[PDB]
Write a protein that binds this ligand. Sequence first.
Ligand SMILES: C[C@@H](OP(=O)(O)O)[C@H](NC(=O)CCCCCCS)C(=O)O
Ligand SMILES: C[C@@H](OP(=O)(O)O)[C@H](NC(=O)CCCCCCS)C(=O)O
Ligand SMILES: O=S(=O)(O)CCS
Ligand SMILES: [Mg+2]
Ligand SMILES: [Mg+2]
Ligand SMILES: [Mg+2]
Ligand SMILES: [Mg+2]
Ligand SMILES: [Mg+2]
Ligand SMILES: [Mg+2]
Ligand SMILES: [Mg+2]
Lengths: 246, 442, 442, 548
Amino acid sequence: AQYYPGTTKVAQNRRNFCNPEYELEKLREISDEDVVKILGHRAPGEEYPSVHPPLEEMDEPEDAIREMVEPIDGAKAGDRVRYIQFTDSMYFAPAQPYVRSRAYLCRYRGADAGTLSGRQIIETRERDLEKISKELLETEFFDPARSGVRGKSVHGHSLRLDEDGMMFDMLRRQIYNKDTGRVEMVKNQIGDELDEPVDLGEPLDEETLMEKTTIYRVDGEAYRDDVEAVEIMQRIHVLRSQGGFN
Amino acid sequence: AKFEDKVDLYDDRGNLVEEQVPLEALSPLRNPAIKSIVQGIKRTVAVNLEGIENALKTAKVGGPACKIMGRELDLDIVGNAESIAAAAKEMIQVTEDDDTNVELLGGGKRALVQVPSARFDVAAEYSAAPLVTATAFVQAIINEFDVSMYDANMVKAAVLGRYPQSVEYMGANIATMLDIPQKLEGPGYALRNIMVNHVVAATLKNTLQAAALSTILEQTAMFEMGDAVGAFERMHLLGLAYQGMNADNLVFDLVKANGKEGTVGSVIADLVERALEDGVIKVEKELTDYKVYGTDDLAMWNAYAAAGLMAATMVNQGAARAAQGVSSTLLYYNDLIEFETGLPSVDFGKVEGTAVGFSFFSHSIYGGGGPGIFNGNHIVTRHSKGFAIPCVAAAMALDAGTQMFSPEATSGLIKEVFSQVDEFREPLKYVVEAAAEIKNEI
Amino acid sequence: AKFEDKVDLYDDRGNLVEEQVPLEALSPLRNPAIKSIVQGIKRTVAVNLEGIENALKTAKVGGPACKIMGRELDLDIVGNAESIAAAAKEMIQVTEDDDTNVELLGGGKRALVQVPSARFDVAAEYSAAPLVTATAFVQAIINEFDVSMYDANMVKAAVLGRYPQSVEYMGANIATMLDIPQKLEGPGYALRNIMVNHVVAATLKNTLQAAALSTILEQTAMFEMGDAVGAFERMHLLGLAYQGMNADNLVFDLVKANGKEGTVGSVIADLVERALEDGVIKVEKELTDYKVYGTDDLAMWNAYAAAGLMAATMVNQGAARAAQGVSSTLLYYNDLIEFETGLPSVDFGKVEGTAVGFSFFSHSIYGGGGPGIFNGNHIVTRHSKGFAIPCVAAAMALDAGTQMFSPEATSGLIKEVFSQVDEFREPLKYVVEAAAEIKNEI
Amino acid sequence: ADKLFINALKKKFEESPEEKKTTFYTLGGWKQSERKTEFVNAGKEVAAKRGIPQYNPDIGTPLGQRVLMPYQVSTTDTYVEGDDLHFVNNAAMQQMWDDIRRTVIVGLNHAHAVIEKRLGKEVTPETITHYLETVNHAMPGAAVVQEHMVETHPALVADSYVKVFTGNDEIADEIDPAFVIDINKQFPEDQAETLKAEVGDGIWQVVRIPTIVSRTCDGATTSRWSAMQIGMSMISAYKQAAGEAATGDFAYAAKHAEVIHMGTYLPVRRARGENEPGGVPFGYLADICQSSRVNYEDPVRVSLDVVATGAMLYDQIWLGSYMSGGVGFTQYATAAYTDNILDDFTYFGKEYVEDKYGLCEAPNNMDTVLDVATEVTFYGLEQYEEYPALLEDQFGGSQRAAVVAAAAGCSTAFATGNAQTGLSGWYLSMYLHKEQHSRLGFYGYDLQDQCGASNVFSIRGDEGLPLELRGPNYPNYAMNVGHQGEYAGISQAPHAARGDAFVFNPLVKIAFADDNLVFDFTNVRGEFAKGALREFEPAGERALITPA
Ligand SMILES: C[C@@H](OP(=O)(O)O)[C@H](NC(=O)CCCCCCS)C(=O)O
Ligand SMILES: C[C@@H](OP(=O)(O)O)[C@H](NC(=O)CCCCCCS)C(=O)O
Ligand SMILES: O=S(=O)(O)CCS
Ligand SMILES: [Mg+2]
Ligand SMILES: [Mg+2]
Ligand SMILES: [Mg+2]
Ligand SMILES: [Mg+2]
Ligand SMILES: [Mg+2]
Ligand SMILES: [Mg+2]
Ligand SMILES: [Mg+2]
């Protein structure tokens, strides 16, 4: 598949995030327990709650589509559907809202993705959400200064950065330590205090954010100069226009 | 035939039924099984005899939480159901042995009623079904027990509710799959105001049959609204056949190839490969490491893309066995396929636009609700001209129990009565059989 | 037969046509001419090609006083009417040999369109007639002149108006006798929302034909509403026969006896004497110098009193050649006959009550208007179940020019087109002939 | 020169507007703001008086971790916190809506024909003037025929009256001038000649019912109230029986056959009668705004005053209350009428088109849409990338999408002279913006945006309509903020560049050219600022009939 037109670094990064045969660069290690803490849906040690019984205990009648589509493991078990949500700064965060939803529906099964200017969300069965969330948090989808895990009070994507290069957060979930140059998550994504903070690594430096970003800007790569990407968007405009007429 | 196209027809197990049938043998205007389904849904009513009896004994009539103390009437309606049903049938029919059906269900607790077809060929619309059914049961109950002139108005309230003070039959103990003509968002929309959960209940959650019934009702409405007239008619018919009727086994085969491990993106890649293999699209220009595709048949490209969009919903929401993400599939299947190809998405962007508002109105505070409560007449999901709602019906058929407003919650009276009717329950069987029967008359 | 009654049927000149016709042969459920009229009403549209051309040339589209400067388009639509109508007809029809009719009138300034009955048998209601007609004419005008994508939306505004920003086709240059389904006062009302001036225009002001068309539409709606089901059916059928079909020549003979010098009161005296002579009423009790009449057949008393009410309208408003007093005749014919007899008036007081409100709302500041702008769906005149509005149609047929909102003011487009159709213009003929044809099948 | 938004940005923040970093969390939360401090204090007083907790800054999350900004009302030097632009707190905004809701236009042409034909009586300038004195007593709720009538208090209903207009100068001259909207006085000479030719010898009433009645009841009251009192004044002034058959023709004409409602009724899911915001087409909203007859040598000022009228009515009052409610949608609307931001972008586009093509001179086609809407979309997006303080001001993507696409769409229509190609430029701007920044608006913002290109030129039943006839009930537009008022501006734009006196209905344009309105429709943004300052005096209050 080709995913997206264009000849800039931005365009190639957008293709890479969509392409399941591109290996997402892993930038940091997070334990399974600390991913459950950041999510905030269950306590370490708590069994997965269920919304319905396991599919095996259901005995549904014959349906060729059900028989051909393998359920994800959380669906087999009857897990609740839960979420993880991110905000990405317009000052060169690596991922951005539509790049996420497009990539999630190429790489992940059983996925409900939503895009907005200040937040982007995925909802799926709980145990599968924990495995996807580890990849979202450990890889180049995430920078701990320019991206934020936030289930509410999302304001910041369009704000000036603070003195430390950190995006605004009304609830201060991610704290940069000026003495150490590392960021710690000190609350879960809905803003409750964690018993012990989770290290998220060092912010990426400016050269690496420019290598990895998927936003076009006049002080980076401008969209108007990626003339092949612009030509495809204008083509889809004109073809939709003519098709609705005759 | 006005068009040259032919399609191969399959069953709900993916086995060939009839080869090379003219496309117009599936048209709502020609297929006799689609006529029988539209006339059946115009004329069929569910009667809750147990609900009438309980409303009367408790004086709980006229809408939620309402009661009139002192007006209670204790009548053995369920115990005398046979005699009441027979008396109501004699009023509902036009002649003895015509197409009127009155059948008890649930040991007399419910009745399936099919008002005779001849009453509709002399009516402007479809309200004779609840109105003639309600009055025949109200008069049969008053006659069974000799209810007095002073008390009979309580029977009327328990059957049809607060109408005509309310515009709707608010609190009624009868139900239809159609809703009142005043609630149409525009003229021609009545076959669109049919709740997704009602289609999933009548088809017993068989995914292909729920998608077929929804596509039949949606694209039939597109005829009545004039959208399938003239330049646009072939686009609508091709959408019916490929997205709703599994023409050429394309939705089935894309689901088979992507069910084990697939995603919305893997279904897009398989559909683009199959459109190129079949000559529906071709490379028009090369840009830098990017092929621009064109087509000389936009209606057929739209129909292949629509079939892919239905298979992507079955793969994504079937994998989660959770309907909610159908709003995301309907958005990003279309968004991704435009940047994958340089061609316009399904319904020229109108599926994507329906899916942006449907996503918002199924995950926000402002309105909407879960996927099952939408319909082609809802303000959020009326905008695509038949290509979106049938995928919601497929996703709700696949849902294993994630919804509070499930078909068990909203549609149990519809389920018990309408799933008895073979053409509503298994319309993919009956409409393909009828198309093969008329194939040399088109 | 369910009923034993028979009636004798006459033409609009008072001559016998067919004797001893079973009552059910005139039922809207059985009579095939009533079926053809109702299906005709559903599928017929008037197209004003001159109006479309003038709206385009001036950019005056979207409702009263509206104009878009700089959007003017000068198209020779009436000069190319034949080609435009033929191209529309090929999109409107289903097949080559169906019952689609497209006919130019007025040198190409107007077209009569009858959409094929088959599009209705797979539709929920009747809006396919204006919506299929409008799109086929918009597409045929665009194709005739090769109107560009940038300008074509002005053709759509000139044909169908401000819809869908407005709920109605506000500013449209097409017209139908029915109105949109959202305007029904209740479910089942659509055959009642037909302006009295449109029935009088269609029937060319022939008084008996205007009364017969109005009664067939009102009483056919009574079946669709369920009012004519079970205990009430015979009442409704005898009303149709005696008030609308001149059964037994009762209406005609009352008018002949009272036309020269009679009043509403002289008609009442004759009708009471005729009821007594036929055995419909009899003296039950003597008070002091006052006979109290009774009846063993309330439906037949009601029908005879209904025939007298129609005759009283024709005598009173015919003598003035001024329709306004129909509101008074509907009130006091019923008020006088109850104190004349001790029996209930037409529709058990519901005509009298409709007449009270109609009188007020045709002589006051609050609403309503002249007789011609009422209809069975109007809030003021919906209350009688078919026994009032036909008299208003007979009164407006008899008006010699007293009304500002006359049929020439409100209904000229409807007159030109719909009076071409023989069964709309002269329904009494066709429904009589049909009743004779099926008389042995009842 | 400085971009037009620089002064406002320099007022909001201590940094120059180009600066990329700031500091947060040290402003004391809500305590930084005069208006939030007023609200905290008032909440405690409210909750004690009524015995139920109410406004409390410690419920939920703590506002004011960043600067709570002032806003400049565009074209003014007035700066206010955004709460002063919420419609609940702004009596000028409430009055703007009451003056539209309580107005109807009612012909006298049928009525004069019933008088001459059915009654056989004469109509002259004299009998019209006598009728207008009578209806100006009756219309606010006072009696002219019956004994023992009880009446409305004149000072509670002092904003209700009836005027007339006509294209016939020599009647407009012969009727008492207190009652006449004088076209020649109110409009420049070229627009006056267009408008008089449209009206011709027709004579039309502009009827305003009392604001206190509109507020008690609803928009569908207005044409009924108007017709009752026209009916009483026709009976009194022309000597009818007080209630005869002809009286019904005056009622049908005033209620149905010669009325112009400001809005048409709505479908049942959003059930509302006439004269509600969702029924007002975009062409009428541009003709209600009176900037066209004052600012006609500046088509950008005329178009942006229409955007301000429509963003406030359709997003704040209509979508943000009638169709939702709560805190609502103040700043989704304020983005289109504050800080001179839309003004900077639209003046750039106008200059681009005047230099390249000349106003109204470009081909009306897709080549022009692709050229102008792409150039103006990139200009507006570049400003948010060059000025960090501008991006932090219009912080929500939906606000930026509506402002950039309004400038692109208006500029396209200034080139073509046709609103439909301006609408196609609005949708192309959305698609380019979404790809440039990898975001657009809120979760549901581009439902109409993605249907948009395909429905601009469609001709199908519920799809096809010129933009001037569309409104908040066009199906794709029925739900979402950040579009409707901007579409009213695009509807105005080609007509302001052409010099046209009106956009869609010349009777509506004349009906608001009246200094007896409470709100001043020639200066909508000035009025919003007066209301924000608590300096506007609305009608409708009950002070005269309540204790001191
Ligand atoms: C969708 C529909 O809600 P329902 O699904 O019918 O509950 C509709 N609301 C809205 O459109 C909300 C529009 C204003 C709030 C969101 C603005 S983006 C209404 O209340 O009639
Ligand atoms: C009849 C109908 O008026 P129209 O005939 O539709 O103009 C209706 N008015 C009324 O019912 C007026 C009732 C109040 C005044 C009379 C009270 S007795 C209405 O405005 O909808
Ligand atoms: O977050 S949502 O798009 O649902 C609503 C924005 S006000
Ligand atoms: Mg690990
Ligand atoms: Mg095979
Ligand atoms: Mg593959
Ligand atoms: Mg006599
Ligand atoms: Mg005696
Ligand atoms: Mg600084
Ligand atoms: Mg002032």
